[PDB]
């Protein structure tokens, strides 16, 4: 029985015998659906994950230069020229610098100067496109009340896993003796990934806006090619210093890693699992089809033996109460007697159960079960079992305006 | 007018709503023989024996198939009964019954074809319920799912009343008054 620990929990209510209920699944959040005359089920989005994305553009945030060369020329001796001037791997700069007798020239004035450097790219970051063919949401479904915090569901009938894509938003999940649930999840309202790039920088991953990505002041290449690619705007990491008569020192700026890290302070963070990316930003409007769902023991007899406590009843973050009971009887499967009475003489049911129609499934003695109850405000009594050996436990619920 | 059948001998009764109890599960590891439960050979119990994958990851020394078996005590909650009508205890009145049975289900009655009745997929017995009857073919309502190390989740089908009813659509509607039955 999940969600009880979860802070951002919802309680979607049913109808009389309806067919559809709308929910919104947020990452880390959880939705407890309680339809009338249906088992209570827990729906939660557990993994948004992207893969096989097409690279769009890579920026360089750490470059190096080697084997630079300059060429000088006196006034009236034409423009300066190197052969490495046309090479794309080489970044260059033209400038005019004062010349005279004091440095080889026949007359005082301006001489031509050119300087080139070989552009290497030590490290780069890559932005990838997020097509619908890359998304794959995974939703977990768990009927309230089973045998016993983690995931080991493949065997459990109360628990089922489903996967959803933008090009396959529909899925069905069988829940054993509880029937089956339906899911039609709109991926458009999921998140506007048509305005987002997936940024990868040295094992660190983010989701960035496309326009912010396009406005990054770094050298860059498009898509990608083996060996050595052609870098545009190399001048973002390579500056020229103060020009002399026959030379001009060229220097590469330091690493721009921390700069970008800071530029990404509020950006969405992505986890990395090999060639797969794993988001934690979740939003999914889903339509739950419920008519194929069913209660297990509508016609069970009640549990006549004694229930006992195993944990002392605790209050959740939402005011509800979780209890864990041990049933010694062997007349299982049977129906669990569980209500809340404000008056022990009449046993008139007040409040409501969250775990709708609790049922012991095993006929072996000393079984365990977790019940969740939604008590009234103030004092009341949690009542479990029947007759003499019934558990009556005083409870109190606090107030409003959080 | 008063077309009336007299006392009838019950042919065969089909259960359409069923329940389980005393459900138990035994599982042995590899090189340690097949699994055994007490009520495995019991006739009131529906059972399932299969082989599940065992290893270190689920509490066993050596890798390989281990023998699992699960047994649940089958019991009937709602059944329909069939009756044979011979042109012997029948009585015409005014102011082919070798092909028909008198089907009765939850206070509603029909006259149905022999073959159709004899070939419906539900648990059944023959004779009459003096209590403790043997239910044949209980697997029609109780199935075993998810072969697993320590257990095997059983599932009981819900009432097949609606399906049986919708099957009897183009069927001869009848009626009864006490220990007899009014025809038409």
């Amino acid at each position, epitope marked *: 029985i999940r969600c009880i620990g979860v802070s951002n929990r919802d309680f979607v209510e049913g109808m009389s015998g309806g067919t559809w209920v709308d929910v919104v699944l947020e990452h880390g959040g959880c939705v407890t659906v309680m339809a009338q005359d249906k088992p209570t089920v827990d729906i939660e989005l557990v993994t948004t994950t992207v893969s096989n994305m097409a690279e769009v553009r890579s920026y360089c945030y750490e470059a190096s230069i080697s084997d630079m060369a300059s060429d000088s020329r006196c006034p009236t001796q034409g423009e300066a020229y190197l052969d490495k001037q046309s090479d794309t791997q080489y970044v260059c700069k033209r400038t005019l610098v004062d010349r005279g007798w004091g440095n080889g020239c026949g007359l005082f004035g301006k001489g031509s100067l050119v300087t080139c450097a070989k552009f290497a790219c030590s490290k780069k970051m890559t932005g990838k496109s997020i097509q619908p063919e890359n998304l794959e949401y995974r939703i977990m479904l768990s009927v309230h009340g089973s045998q016993h915090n983690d995931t080991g569901h*493949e*065997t459990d009938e109360n628990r089922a896993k489903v996967e959803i894509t933008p090009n396959s938003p529909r899925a069905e999940a069988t829940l054993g003796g509880f029937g089956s649930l339906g899911l039609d999840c709109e991926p458009r309202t999921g998140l506007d990934f048509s305005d987002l790039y997936y940024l990868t920088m040295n094992n660190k991953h983010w989701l960035v806006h496309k326009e912010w990505f396009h406005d990054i002041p770094l050298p860059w290449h498009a898509g990608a090619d083996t060996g050595t690619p052609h870098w545009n705007n190399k001048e973002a990491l390579v500056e020229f210093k103060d020009a002399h008569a026959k030379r001009q020192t060229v220097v590469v700026l330091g690493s721009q890693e921390g700069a970008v890290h800071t530029a990404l302070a509020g950006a969405l963070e992505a986890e990395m*699992d090999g060639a797969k990316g794993r988001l934690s930003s979740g939003h999914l409007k889903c339509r739950l089809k419920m008519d194929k769902l069913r209660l297990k023991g509508v016609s069970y007899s009640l549990c006549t033996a004694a229930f006992t406590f195993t944990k002392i009843p605790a209050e959740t973050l939402h005011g509800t109460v979780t209890v864990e009971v041990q049933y010694a009887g062997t007349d299982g499967p049977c129906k669990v007697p569980a209500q809340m009475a404000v008056d022990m003489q009449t046993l008139t049911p007040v409040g409501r159960l969250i775990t709708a129609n609790p049922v012991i499934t095993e006929s072996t003695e000393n079984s365990k079960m977790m019940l969740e109850l939604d008590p009234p405000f103030g004092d009341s009594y949690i009542v479990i079992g029947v007759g003499e050996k019934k558990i009556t436990h005083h409870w109190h619920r606090s107030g409003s305006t959080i | 007018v008063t077309t009336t059948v007299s006392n009838m001998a019950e042919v065969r009764s089909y259960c359409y709503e069923a329940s389980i109890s005393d459900m138990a599960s035994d599982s042995r590891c590899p090189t340690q023989g097949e699994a055994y439960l007490d009520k495995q050979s019991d006739t009131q119990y529906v059972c399932k024996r299969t082989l599940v994958d065992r290893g270190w990851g689920n509490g066993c020394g050596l890798f390989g198939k281990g023998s699992l078996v699960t047994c649940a005590k089958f019991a009937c909650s709602k059944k329909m009964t069939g009756k044979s009508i011979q042109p012997e205890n029948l009585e015409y009145r005014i102011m082919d019954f070798s092909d028909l049975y008198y089907l009765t289900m939850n206070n509603k009655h029909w006259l149905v074809h022999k073959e159709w009745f004899h070939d419906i997929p539900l648990p059944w017995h023959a004779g009459a319920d003096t209590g403790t009857p043997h239910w044949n073919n209980k697997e029609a309502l109780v199935e075993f799912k998810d072969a697993h190390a320590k257990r095997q989740t059983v599932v009981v089908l819900g009432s097949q009343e609606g399906a049986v009813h919708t099957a009897l659509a183009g069927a001869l509607e009848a009626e009864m008054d006490g220990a007899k039955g009014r025809l038409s």
Partner: antibody
Amino acid sequence: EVQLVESGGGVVQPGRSLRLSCAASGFTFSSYAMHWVRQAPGKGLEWVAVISYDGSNKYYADSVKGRFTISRDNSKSTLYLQMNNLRAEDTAVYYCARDHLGWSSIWSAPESFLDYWGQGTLVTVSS
Amino acid sequence: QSVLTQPPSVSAAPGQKVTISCSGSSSNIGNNYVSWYQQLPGTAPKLLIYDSNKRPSGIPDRFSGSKSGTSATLGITGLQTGDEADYYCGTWDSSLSVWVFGGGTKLTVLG
């Protein structure tokens, strides 16, 4: 340009030990999980072991438990398998293999598949 | 006799169509992702299918993958003699906490 190269296998004797190595070149080796998968002569593939992206998670076949020890050096992009107390039925061509995931999650294992494969190394336990 | 069971062998004429199955449990094939691996004679295994029905680049559209219940199928159509090989299904097993391969299936293209 992904490539994996196994090495360190030969004609070893039983009871003793051996240490296989795999050289990776074409990826961020310290970002993907790594597999050891062996194949007896003219037999089927038998998955031996797996280690995660950082080396905090290791899984072994029930046949090679308490005898084999998988490890890795991210610093030089190498995969090590440490087999001690060998047997006859450990005789096989040993392949190392790139996963697709690094196994950085709970959901990693159920999605895992062996992406790129090496070329193998014959390990004979002759006695 | 195997955790994932696939038939020992299968055969078909050139130009025909053949499918290879492997069956498991809810703890492996049922919930996890099935992948297929082709092993040509005297050659390292090669990834054929991933995520139960996806093809790596370079793998022709003749190859297809499907998954239903606790069994998965690989489909090879427009069969060629070059397809003659040993085919393996594989997936992670959650109960045994162990990655598992199928027994293998020798595909022969009758000549």
